[PDB]
Amino acid sequence: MLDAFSRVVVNSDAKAAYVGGSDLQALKSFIADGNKRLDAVNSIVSNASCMVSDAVSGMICENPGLISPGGNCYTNRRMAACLRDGEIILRYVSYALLAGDASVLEDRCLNGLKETYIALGVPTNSSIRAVSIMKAQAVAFITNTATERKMSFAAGDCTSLASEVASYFDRVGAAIS
Amino acid sequence: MLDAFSRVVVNSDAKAAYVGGSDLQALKSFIADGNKRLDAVNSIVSNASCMVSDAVSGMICENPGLISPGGNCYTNRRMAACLRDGEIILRYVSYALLAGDASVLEDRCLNGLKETYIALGVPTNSSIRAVSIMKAQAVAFITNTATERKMSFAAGDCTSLASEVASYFDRVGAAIS
Amino acid sequence: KFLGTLKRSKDPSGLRLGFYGRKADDFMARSIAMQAKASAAGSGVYTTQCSEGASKGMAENARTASLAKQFRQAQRSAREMSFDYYEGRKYAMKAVGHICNYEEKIFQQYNKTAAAYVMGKQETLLSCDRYAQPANKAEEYIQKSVQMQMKKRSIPYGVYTTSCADGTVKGMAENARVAKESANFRARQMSAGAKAAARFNARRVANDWHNNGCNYEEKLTSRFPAAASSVRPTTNRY
Amino acid sequence: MKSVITTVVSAADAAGRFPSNSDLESIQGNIQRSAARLEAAEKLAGNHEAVVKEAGDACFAKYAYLKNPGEAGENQEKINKCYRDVDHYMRLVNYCLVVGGTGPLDEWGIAGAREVYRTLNLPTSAYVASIAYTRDRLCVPRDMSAQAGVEFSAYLDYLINALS
Amino acid sequence: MKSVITTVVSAADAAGRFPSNSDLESIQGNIQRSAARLEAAEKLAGNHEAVVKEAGDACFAKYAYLKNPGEAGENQEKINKCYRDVDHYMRLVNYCLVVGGTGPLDEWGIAGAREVYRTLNLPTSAYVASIAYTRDRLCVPRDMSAQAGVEFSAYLDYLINALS
Amino acid sequence: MKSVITTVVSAADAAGRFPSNSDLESIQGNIQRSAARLEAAEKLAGNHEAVVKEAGDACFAKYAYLKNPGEAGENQEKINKCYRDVDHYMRLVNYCLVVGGTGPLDEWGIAGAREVYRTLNLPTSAYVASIAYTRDRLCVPRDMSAQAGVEFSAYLDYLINALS
Amino acid sequence: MKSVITTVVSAADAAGRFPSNSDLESIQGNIQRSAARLEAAEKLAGNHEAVVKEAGDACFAKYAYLKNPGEAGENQEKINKCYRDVDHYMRLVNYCLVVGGTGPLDEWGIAGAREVYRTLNLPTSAYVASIAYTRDRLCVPRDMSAQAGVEFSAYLDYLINALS
Numbered sequence A, B: 001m002l003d004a005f006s007r008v009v010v011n012s013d014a015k016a017a018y019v020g021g022s023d024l025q026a027l028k029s030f031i032a033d034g035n036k037r038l039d040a041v042n043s044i045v046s047n048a049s050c051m052v053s054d055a056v057s058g059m060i061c062e063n064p065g066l067i068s069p070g071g072n073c074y075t076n077r078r079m080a081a082c083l084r085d086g087e088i089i090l091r092y093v094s095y096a097l098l099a100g101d102a103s104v105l106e107d108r109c110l111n112g113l114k115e116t117y118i119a120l121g122v123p124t125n126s127s128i129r130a131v132s133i134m135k136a137q138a139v140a141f142i143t144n145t146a147t148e149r150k151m152s153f154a155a156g157d158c159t160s161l162a163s164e165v166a167s168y169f170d171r172v173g174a175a176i177s
Numbered sequence C: 001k002f003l004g005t006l007k008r009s010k011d012p013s014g015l016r017l018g019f020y021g022r023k024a025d026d027f028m029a030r031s032i033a034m035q036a037k038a039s040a041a042g043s044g045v046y047t048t049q050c051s052e053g054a055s056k057g058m059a060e061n062a063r064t065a066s067l068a069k070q071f072r073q074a075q076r077s078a079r080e081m082s083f084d085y086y087e088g089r090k091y092a093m094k095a096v097g098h099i100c101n102y103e104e105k106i107f108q109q110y111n112k113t114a115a116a117y118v119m120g121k122q123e124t125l126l127s128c129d130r131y132a133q134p135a136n137k138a139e140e141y142i143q144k145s146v147q148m149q150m151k152k153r154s155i156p157y158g159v160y161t162t163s164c165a166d167g168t169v170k171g172m173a174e175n176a177r178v179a180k181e182s183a184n185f186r187a188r189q190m191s192a193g194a195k196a197a198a199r200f201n202a203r204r205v206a207n208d209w210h211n212n213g214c215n216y217e218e219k220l221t222s223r224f225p226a227a228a229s230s231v232r233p234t235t236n237r238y
Numbered sequence D, E, F, G: 001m002k003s004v005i006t007t008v009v010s011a012a013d014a015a016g017r018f019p020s021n022s023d024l025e026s027i028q029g030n031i032q033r034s035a036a037r038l039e040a041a042e043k044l045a046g047n048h049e050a051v052v053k054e055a056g057d058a059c060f061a062k063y064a065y066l067k068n069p070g071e072a073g074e075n076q077e078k079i080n081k082c083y084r085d086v087d088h089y090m091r092l093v094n095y096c097l098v099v100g101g102t103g104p105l106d107e108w109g110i111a112g113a114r115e116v117y118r119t120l121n122l123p124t125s126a127y128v129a130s131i132a133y134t135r136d137r138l139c140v141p142r143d144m145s146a147q148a149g150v151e152f153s154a155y156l157d158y159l160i161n162a163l164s
């Protein structure tokens, strides 16, 4: 759809700006951090069955009101849609981490998604809790501060993607709020 | 469906075998030839409307039988349906060279292609003549023996691609016959 | 006074079940279509039964075919806007095989979801038009004749309808003719087993939810599946 | 839009699927030849007033019939709009050296070009041949680098190819 | 099948459209990292008899209940078929390092795996955990190159993901 | 084909319906003005060699650029085919004065005219303007009857309209 | 509706196409015989109370069984509604002499006539035979002009044909 190579052209097409080397060097840092950017996205797709079993178990650890029958999320088909909705939001941020841009998150997920949940009856507060576990484990997966799981890497600072992924998950959270 | 990477894994599939250290030195030519293969494929897709306008004009050069009224190919929608059929051999013989294998060519056009042409009254002798024009112009474009078009290249051989592309237009010439 | 709270009635000629419900309704049916685009591409192929163009590029010209269908279904009149709401509700009961507490409890309040299910689930089987190939001259002729009554359904009388208009400009007039003739070839082009699975799939829409009770119309499917595959009883006015 | 981002993040959504390493591989070819692609962009940004004027009456030399009344070039007010028309083609080809593919060309300046021009009695044969003047108008080790002209020249004969 | 050839030459046919430069761009990412992808293939071709035996009783250490009669591993005739079963998974993952995507996995060894195993009373929990033994069983600068393990390891946790 | 027979016997079949008096009425307008329509047909049958030559170099006066090599009119062998090309347009317009509608025009000589000409580098702007020379080239009480030119002239500006 | 306007401006929209001269020809047959069609309309407007009464008991002579209780004509309250019923057929046939085709007949008084009458135990055989009384009830050089009865009589046997 739209990405960081195409973000710098749509403000320049809106001004008919012939693009020269005053804004290329911010993309040249994106050019030079190509392999650093792909270094974070392969630690996040390699444990994606762990995170979908970590978050909504950690969401049912903090609040047992949903597994009570007559609540929201309790029975067997009902929990199948919990892993259904919970996995697909991890698919979209992994698209958004690669583009340098959450534009592909913003159109395929973030249109109208909030009040479909209350036209169903999803509590929006429990979905802020599940996305915050998915925010907190993913920033522990793009670095080496996991409990047992240490992949092999090349060292140095990579906080610049941790500020990128933390600016993506709250964009999910403010969309469903 | 299947590139020249993967001709050597479906026959090892039939023996419960794996691709051990004896069969892939032609593949280690085939990955070391990544940028000589790339320097042939810009030279075809740059002048793609030359080659469909050189083939059908050279076909109506040698044959004024179709231009007669009541023939196969004389009128307006009809010659417009030729430039449908004139490019689609060139369209998939690109991917026969891009993948390296004509298996992407074998199911996607060559299934049922000959029997539709007698069901549409298309004479196959003008079809096999126009594809031999398309072979003769493509081997002068992957090499440096065109008339006026002189693209920039690095020197060396690409007669290994000239034998690959010669084994392609014969394969479509055997399937429309 | 009575703070104008004075409210008479009005004709919306639509769903009118909430502004919040209306903007909800196109999102999940987009997700129903993207569910069903992911069964077409279960294995990661844009599979050859879906065609939406010609030889020459013209899918931006077939954008203007489909956005006309985006527009002509929006400018439907009040009879056909309301008839298609209720016939699609019982057809969504026909579209799902099982009987739920869930699926029709979307599909009878919401109608785009019912409409994107009778289009979406049925396109990733191979009981549609122009995809099942007839064997002989005898099968294609009654395949042709049941299409004539689907002309007679969408053209009920001397007026031609607004909804088989398939074009607006001179460029897309003959583009719509050469679009189907490439797609008619891509039925008999693509495979040998998926088109063999089509003729068993053609009884999977006609026998079970189109001609119940008529054995004659039941063995017409099992003797002629490709003739029973463009019978198109999903009344989409096409 | 049209780029490799429009291929692989859309096909993974069309498969309902993760960004696997098929998708992560496809953008690596941007990185090794963006330096090849983006010294071509400031050439026609540096010549954005230079080669619009040299292409108009090179076209109007071989299309000199337009100056009669009742046609596409009956006054200078047409020619004042005509250097706008080649430059508006020339804006988009500059942008396709930045996005990689032909992104700003097809959804803005290519699709439905064959519903406009001779309806406005504008000759389409002069439109491709003004561009085909500029297609061969290059010199690869002298104007730009040798790695820069093969993105430029492949987009200009595409403009004749996309009008076909 | 499933590759980038299955994306772009099929989507151009699904649009009824030319192989435009969106389709020509998507295969360039094959070329720059096929050398990254295809020294991983001869590792498990070189270890096609080495790591089948080390994965079976690593699975049968943590699944040691099978040896009773009336279950999935009641005799050595089951275990003679069981090293066939992990190797038949192991054949296909080798081939997906060649075609790029997961081409031979989904249409041959993945789809309808959840209609077979416990119907034949075969435990699916041992099937992913035999594979998850081999998923972390790698060492990226020591066994292969560092550019080779990230195609290998992303396919093995996919095998647990595709059974989900 | 395209006539009033193609309207009403096809719409009664498209309704699955009898030839009712809506269909019987539509052909009565053929009868009262076939005498208006069919003294125009023997004019351009009488001038089938007269006005082909007067339209070619009236077009080639205002399109005189063609005679260079590398274009559409580089030799007399093109011009020997070019008087064939205007006459093949001129054959069909004669036949549309007989069938009533534009029957032989659309299915034979109009549809897909915009996929042929500039692909064969033939200028479409000269094609409509050779016809637009002959469009105003009439004199209604002097050449034919006054009831004959309004079928003739409405088909010739249609040829510019159908190329739009 | 149903007229020649419903043919050709709808088929040009169904082709996505201009009103070409196939569409402009079809309405000329309205003009030369609207004078033939529209002295028939004021006959049954002048006899809108005259021939409703002469058709009811001409039908009730050959259908005289209705006057028993438990049937369609058990009281005068049925017969007061019955002269309304033939006149409501008679209103629409007057309007089809104005619109040309059978416009007000099919969408208002014909379609689904075979879902109503014997469900309301009304005999359909008396409905066509009351109309077939009036079908032959004409005298073409004496009541109206000779050019007026052939639109009238072709609509009345159509009413038996449309109930078939």
Ligand SMILES: C=CC1=C(C)[C@@H](Cc2[nH]c(/C=C3N=C(/C=C4/NC(=O)[C@H](C)[C@H]4CC)C(C)=C/3CCC(=O)O)c(CCC(=O)O)c2C)NC1=O
Binding pocket: D043, D044, D046, D047, D050, D051, D137, D138, D139, D140, D142, D143
């Ligand atoms: C992006 C497109 C673009 C262009 C094409 C140029 C347009 C252009 N090119 C040339 C530069 C030129 N330089 C040469 C010299 C050459 N020596 C050789 O060995 C070759 C045969 C040939 C390469 C073409 C020629 C023939 C011209 C065109 C004629 C001219 O000088 O004006 C000049 C003259 C000034 C100069 O030398 O720079 C101009 C205005 N600018 C642009 O922005």
Ligand SMILES: C=CC1=C(C)[C@@H](Cc2[nH]c(/C=C3N=C(/C=C4/NC(=O)[C@H](C)[C@H]4CC)C(C)=C/3CCC(=O)O)c(CCC(=O)O)c2C)NC1=O
Binding pocket: E043, E044, E046, E047, E050, E051, E137, E138, E139, E140, E142, E143
């Ligand atoms: C395709 C999959 C595949 C495999 C996994 C291996 C399987 C395997 N790996 C090792 C090689 C090994 N090498 C190490 C050494 C290491 N040093 C470190 O700094 C790291 C922590 C660790 C990387 C794992 C360890 C721990 C093992 C496994 C234990 C063993 O030696 O058998 C050995 C022993 C012989 C050898 O050293 O090669 C075997 C059979 N072969 C295969 O074909």
Ligand SMILES: C=CC1=C(C)[C@@H](Cc2[nH]c(/C=C3N=C(/C=C4/NC(=O)[C@H](C)[C@H]4CC)C(C)=C/3CCC(=O)O)c(CCC(=O)O)c2C)NC1=O
Binding pocket: G043, G044, G046, G047, G050, G051, G137, G138, G139, G140, G142, G143
């Ligand atoms: C629109 C339908 C319509 C009708 C049918 C009439 C109905 C009608 N027709 C006739 C007129 C009639 N005129 C004739 C004379 C005729 N001389 C011949 O050479 C023929 C055989 C025959 C033509 C039928 C006959 C037989 C009748 C019917 C019997 C009668 O006089 O009532 C009369 C008697 C008064 C009159 O003469 O006008 C009436 C009420 N009015 C209507 O509005």
Ligand SMILES: C=CC1=C(C)[C@@H](Cc2[nH]c(/C=C3N=C(/C=C4\NC(=O)[C@H](C)[C@H]4CC)C(C)=C\3CCC(=O)O)c(CCC(=O)O)c2C)NC1=O
Binding pocket: A007, A008, A009, A010, A011, A012, A014
């Ligand atoms: C707190 C709120 C907030 C904002 C208001 C923006 C403000 C903002 N926008 C841009 C910069 C930009 N912003 C846009 C986007 C747009 N240009 C348009 O034509 C549209 C109106 C709009 C959405 C499509 C683009 C395309 C650029 C880069 C080029 C340009 O300036 O036009 C920049 C420069 C650095 C950057 O790219 O982030 C900043 C600070 N950012 C924020 O954090």
Ligand SMILES: C=CC1=C(C)[C@@H](Cc2[nH]c(/C=C3N=C(/C=C4\NC(=O)[C@H](C)[C@H]4CC)C(C)=C\3CCC(=O)O)c(CCC(=O)O)c2C)NC1=O
Binding pocket: A047, A049, A050, A051, A054, A055, A057, A058, A059, A060, A061, A062, A132, A133, A136, A137, A138, A140, A141, A145, A146, A147, A148, A149
């Ligand atoms: C009582 C219920 C209960 C649970 C079910 C777990 C679930 C759980 N895990 C984490 C938090 C986390 N969970 C993981 C995920 C994983 N860690 C691993 O060792 C694996 C590799 C991987 C699962 C496959 C990571 C990396 C963190 C971050 C902190 C940490 O390293 O533990 C959090 C905190 C989230 C936050 O801070 O917002 C919770 C609630 N914890 C609980 O208290």
Ligand SMILES: C=CC1=C(C)[C@@H](Cc2[nH]c(/C=C3N=C(/C=C4\NC(=O)[C@H](C)[C@H]4CC)C(C)=C\3CCC(=O)O)c(CCC(=O)O)c2C)NC1=O
Binding pocket: A034, A035, A036, A038, A039, A040, A042, A142, A143, A144, A153, A154, A155, A156, A157, A158, A159, A161, D021, D024, D025, E146, E150
């Ligand atoms: C498509 C598959 C693919 C990958 C998985 C990565 C794998 C990867 N990461 C790094 C290399 C690196 N990666 C990081 C980033 C990190 N390192 C850490 O320890 C943290 C876990 C993480 C923070 C997000 C840093 C800081 C370097 C060092 C850069 C260097 O070595 O020059 C390198 C060396 C190349 C370089 O960046 O210069 C490679 C190949 N690249 C790829 O192309």
Ligand SMILES: C=CC1=C(C)[C@@H](Cc2[nH]c(/C=C3N=C(/C=C4\NC(=O)[C@H](C)[C@H]4CC)C(C)=C\3CCC(=O)O)c(CCC(=O)O)c2C)NC1=O
Binding pocket: B047, B049, B050, B051, B054, B055, B057, B058, B059, B061, B062, B132, B133, B134, B136, B137, B138, B140, B141, B145, B146, B147, B148, B149
């Ligand atoms: C009687 C009418 C007549 C024609 C219309 C042309 C058409 C034509 N061209 C070629 C042959 C060819 N045609 C081309 C194509 C091109 N060459 C260029 O200089 C352009 C760049 C490009 C068109 C855009 C090429 C590259 C060859 C191969 C030999 C050559 O270089 O000329 C052939 C021989 C085919 C064969 O040998 O199989 C024919 C018949 N020749 C004729 O005799």
Ligand SMILES: C=CC1=C(C)[C@@H](Cc2[nH]c(/C=C3N=C(/C=C4\NC(=O)[C@H](C)[C@H]4CC)C(C)=C\3CCC(=O)O)c(CCC(=O)O)c2C)NC1=O
Binding pocket: C028, C031, C032, C035, C036, C098, C099, C100, C101, C102, C103, C106
């Ligand atoms: C985004 C919107 C959305 C919905 C409204 C539902 C509706 C729905 N269910 C199924 C899919 C299914 N639906 C059922 C139906 C049922 N199972 C039972 O036991 C009940 C009796 C009955 C109603 C609940 C079954 C058994 C399947 C799996 C097999 C099949 O595809 O038919 C599918 C096909 C694709 C898929 O598997 O998701 C869809 C669209 N699912 C969605 O994704």
Ligand SMILES: C=CC1=C(C)[C@@H](Cc2[nH]c(/C=C3N=C(/C=C4\NC(=O)[C@H](C)[C@H]4CC)C(C)=C\3CCC(=O)O)c(CCC(=O)O)c2C)NC1=O
Binding pocket: C142, C146, C149, C206, C210, C211, C212, C213, C214, C215, C216, C217, C220, C221, C227, C228, C231, C233
């Ligand atoms: C060759 C393919 C073929 C079929 C699959 C069926 C299905 C079918 N039946 C009808 C149309 C009809 N179908 C029936 C059939 C039945 N109504 C009943 O009460 C019985 C249960 C059942 C079998 C006797 C009837 C009575 C009609 C006419 C009324 C209607 O339009 O529904 C139509 C619309 C037009 C048509 O008649 O074709 C179609 C597609 N008919 C076919 O020609």
Ligand SMILES: C=CC1=C(C)[C@@H](Cc2[nH]c(/C=C3N=C(/C=C4\NC(=O)[C@H](C)[C@H]4CC)C(C)=C\3CCC(=O)O)c(CCC(=O)O)c2C)NC1=O
Binding pocket: D056, D059, D066, D072, D073, D078, D079, D081, D082, D083, D084, D085, D086, D088, D089, D108, D109, D116, D120, D122, D123, D126, D127, D130
């Ligand atoms: C941003 C996208 C964009 C384009 C690709 C071009 C294409 C284009 N040109 C014109 C419109 C025009 N284009 C031309 C140009 C020419 N006529 C000729 O025959 C010569 C070959 C050439 C001059 C060198 C002229 C003269 C008009 C005006 C036509 C008129 O008003 O009659 C129009 C109609 C709207 C308008 O007036 O702008 C469009 C879409 N213009 C654009 O805005």
Ligand SMILES: C=CC1=C(C)[C@@H](Cc2[nH]c(/C=C3N=C(/C=C4\NC(=O)[C@H](C)[C@H]4CC)C(C)=C\3CCC(=O)O)c(CCC(=O)O)c2C)NC1=O
Binding pocket: E056, E059, E066, E072, E073, E078, E079, E081, E082, E083, E084, E085, E086, E088, E089, E108, E109, E116, E120, E122, E123, E126, E127, E130
């Ligand atoms: C080419 C694709 C392909 C696969 C992916 C596997 C999967 C697979 N395994 C078995 C069949 C089997 N698979 C196993 C294996 C095991 N049982 C366990 O519980 C252990 C975890 C594991 C041994 C390590 C056994 C023991 C059988 C035989 C079951 C039986 O016959 O009862 C079958 C049924 C047909 C057959 O017998 O082959 C299939 C499809 N086999 C294949 O041919």
Ligand SMILES: C=CC1=C(C)[C@@H](Cc2[nH]c(/C=C3N=C(/C=C4\NC(=O)[C@H](C)[C@H]4CC)C(C)=C\3CCC(=O)O)c(CCC(=O)O)c2C)NC1=O
Binding pocket: B057, B067, B074, B075, B076, B079, F056, F059, F066, F072, F073, F078, F079, F081, F082, F083, F084, F085, F086, F088, F089, F108, F109, F116, F120, F122, F123, F126, F127, F130
């Ligand atoms: C029966 C339907 C019918 C038509 C409507 C015309 C249209 C038409 N003309 C040509 C083909 C041609 N048409 C022309 C004519 C001209 N070129 C110009 O630029 C001048 C304006 C004009 C002369 C006055 C020429 C010169 C060719 C040959 C082109 C070539 O071979 O390069 C062709 C390609 C096949 C052929 O050579 O015939 C077609 C379909 N010819 C037909 O058979």
Ligand SMILES: C=CC1=C(C)[C@@H](Cc2[nH]c(/C=C3N=C(/C=C4\NC(=O)[C@H](C)[C@H]4CC)C(C)=C\3CCC(=O)O)c(CCC(=O)O)c2C)NC1=O
Binding pocket: G056, G059, G066, G072, G073, G078, G079, G081, G082, G083, G084, G085, G086, G088, G089, G108, G109, G116, G120, G122, G123, G126, G127, G130
């Ligand atoms: C505008 C369109 C229009 C029509 C075409 C007719 C047709 C028609 N007639 C009746 C209804 C009727 N029609 C008749 C008439 C007759 N019964 C007979 O057997 C005799 C042959 C004949 C008298 C001469 C009677 C008696 C009823 C009343 C039936 C009842 O109420 O039981 C109804 C039901 C609604 C109503 O009562 O009006 C309709 C639609 N009426 C219309 O409004």
Ligand SMILES: CCC1=C(C)[C@@H](CC2=N/C(=C\c3[nH]c(C[C@@H]4NC(=O)C(C)=C4CC)c(C)c3CCC(=O)O)C(CCC(=O)O)=C2C)NC1=O
Binding pocket: C037, C040, C041, C046, C047, C049, C050, C051, C052, C057, C059, C060, C062, C063, C064, C066, C067, D010, D011, D014, E010, E011, E012, E014, E015, E017, E018, E020, E022
């Ligand atoms: C809403 C009206 C509408 C459109 C559609 C597009 C029209 C359109 N479709 C396309 C292309 C197109 N058409 C299809 C077919 C079909 N569609 C799918 O999303 C899947 C999974 C399908 C298979 C059955 C596919 C797969 C593509 C390729 C790109 C894509 O959509 O992912 C392309 C670009 C490809 C090219 O460059 O040639 C365009 C412009 N525009 C519009 O205005």
